Amino acid sequence: ITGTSTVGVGRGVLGDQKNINTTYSTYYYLQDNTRGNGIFTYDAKYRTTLPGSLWADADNQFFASYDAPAVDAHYYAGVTYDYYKNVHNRLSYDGNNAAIRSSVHYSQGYNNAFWNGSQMVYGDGDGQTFIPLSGGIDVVAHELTHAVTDYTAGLIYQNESGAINEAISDIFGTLVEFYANKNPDWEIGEDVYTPGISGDSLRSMSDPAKYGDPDHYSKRYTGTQDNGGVHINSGIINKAAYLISQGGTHYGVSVVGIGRDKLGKIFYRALTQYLTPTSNFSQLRAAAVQSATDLYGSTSQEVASVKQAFDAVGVK
Template sequence: MADDEAPAVGHGFHSGTVPLTTAYNGETYELKDPTRGNMSGYLDGRNSAGSVESVLFTDTDNEWGDGTKSDKASQAVDAQYAATKAWDYFANVHGRKGFDGEGRALNLHGRIPGVPLPNGRPAYQKERDDRPARITYASPGQERGKDVLYKQVDIATLDLVGGAFAMGIASTEAGLPSLDDTPGHPELEEPYAIGAATADIFGTMVEFYANNRVDRPDYLIGERFTAGFPAGTFNDPVSMAKPSVGCWITKIRTEKGPALHFFYLLAVGSNPTEGEASPTCNGMPVTGIGNDKAAKIWYRALTEYFAEKTDYAAARIATLKAAADLYGAHSLEYNTVNAAWSAVSVSGSNPIPGGQTPYTVNPGDQDAVVKTAVSLQLAATNPGGRPLTYTAVGLPPGLTIDAASGLISGTPTKTGDYRVTVGVTDTLHAQSTTWFMWYVA
């Protein structure tokens, strides 16, 4: 143990009682972690001259905070603990030391009234001439805005602070823009969405890595941040399984929802045995490959293929290449990446030609008469020779499909024009879809 390294106990509002590593300077304990790049916790405020001043948190007995949401030291514990878990997650899972890969820490700065907080949540702030890169978060008592009546407290959660740490990686490694970079630069709107999604994806993975008994892991973003405020103050937390915008469309360029939806489908799937069902945009099922593989694919794409102007189309190609690097071209993992992107309406070319993807044969438009039985056998090419599963979405009421055989049958019960999407998937998750109209008179 280094001379100034001291095991400490912290009492956080979000994290509960947790271990920390601090430093002893010979007179007092400092919220500074010598084992993780001297990562330190500060309180920012305005001094008598009106300028912002950062003061390092110190303590006399090395037991930090009282666990209440009104205590500044307790929130500093939450922030320090979350950043510690983020550091350890990237070091132990991805082999990355510090946010920059070279062992540098992101210090934690709690803001008090009079010092604005960017974006209303813990935020990564780039290095400037007058200060190093850091994470800022709100301290108890800060108002969010002059037209808002609530107080902004208790936001130093595992997923939000972990996400800010990950945004530091996204900015440093790939040059992905932050929100401050996008005004007046529409070409950066989708890259910002990819960066914001990266933050939430890895913030969630940090939450799972920590497996904290108070802030339990889930696929909700900022759920404890939301719960810490008066009822009705905030909208519901973002759900990766069912984000408000879960399908990519060109008119919503700054939305991170499709990327979060993609990751959930890749990791968990559309209809898991455990966890929340996640409807797909194309009606096709997706079977997840697990958090570990999904996160490793996104991390490799981030560090090897993402760039400043990576948009959704480029992110799809990057993650396919990453999956091929890690697990092989046209492997189950590769095919699941492709299926998950298609399931959020992001499609495109195959960056690695070949494979044995089955293709549904389009049966052409169909006519039927209400209350008259029909039967339609779907066909599909199957170059891989693996068992196939058929799906159909949008069938006229009264009709069903046999998933194993692809036979659509039944008796239509309602007249109308129906757009039917049919698809086929093999056991390596390779899949394809096509659509036709079914007119019921």
């Protein structure tokens, strides 16, 4: 909508207060005009028809329980845009400031979120397995990173290229969580998963096997479920990325860590310059080696740590 940019206030899914960029034209809309061609948040009204209605509010205050997922989807989309722009000099998911759209209150008791090729979609959860999924910044950045992958490498969503697709979204989800510096960790979804149970999460990057996911190529899943295990075998690449950043000894192989910033630079370059739609894990290794080489030198510690990490998880 056309109108005047302003700033509202609301409460997110976890009860924290925050300011959000809105647009005023009779109503106050969840339209952020300060970032590219805009961040737009929609109400799907418990249906599955998308996008739904642009979120409209009478007084620019968003403290109703029904508002909370909209507040976080809108706010965390902005934070993710800021991450890509300030850290990687990328303007939105397509590199030319495409509008970012999200719908919340999708369906009833829907325990998931997703990028559908054009927009983000967030369920409310059933209140036991999940609370509303936009409450997790790593979840939002995960979904939006899918859009980045779709416009760059284009990894097909099955078998090893799908696992890489998934791992990239967990990696940049986590890096966005560290960038915002709100209780950062190497777990996925801990803020919105199982409100009854502390200390757990959907997946772990530091120790994928905590929840049954492979942490070594020899344990990869070879069946047909989950599009050939795209959310399972991602654990192999997530562990590798954890090792590159933090270091550690894994199946007898020691890796010197180089830190989060360099991890991000290497995987961003690998994604945007070297990976293709059918890249497999072995091709990812070569892309990350070449990326580190480009950035730091063939004899750098950085190239050495990338090699050590993939050796540790058994990717040749």
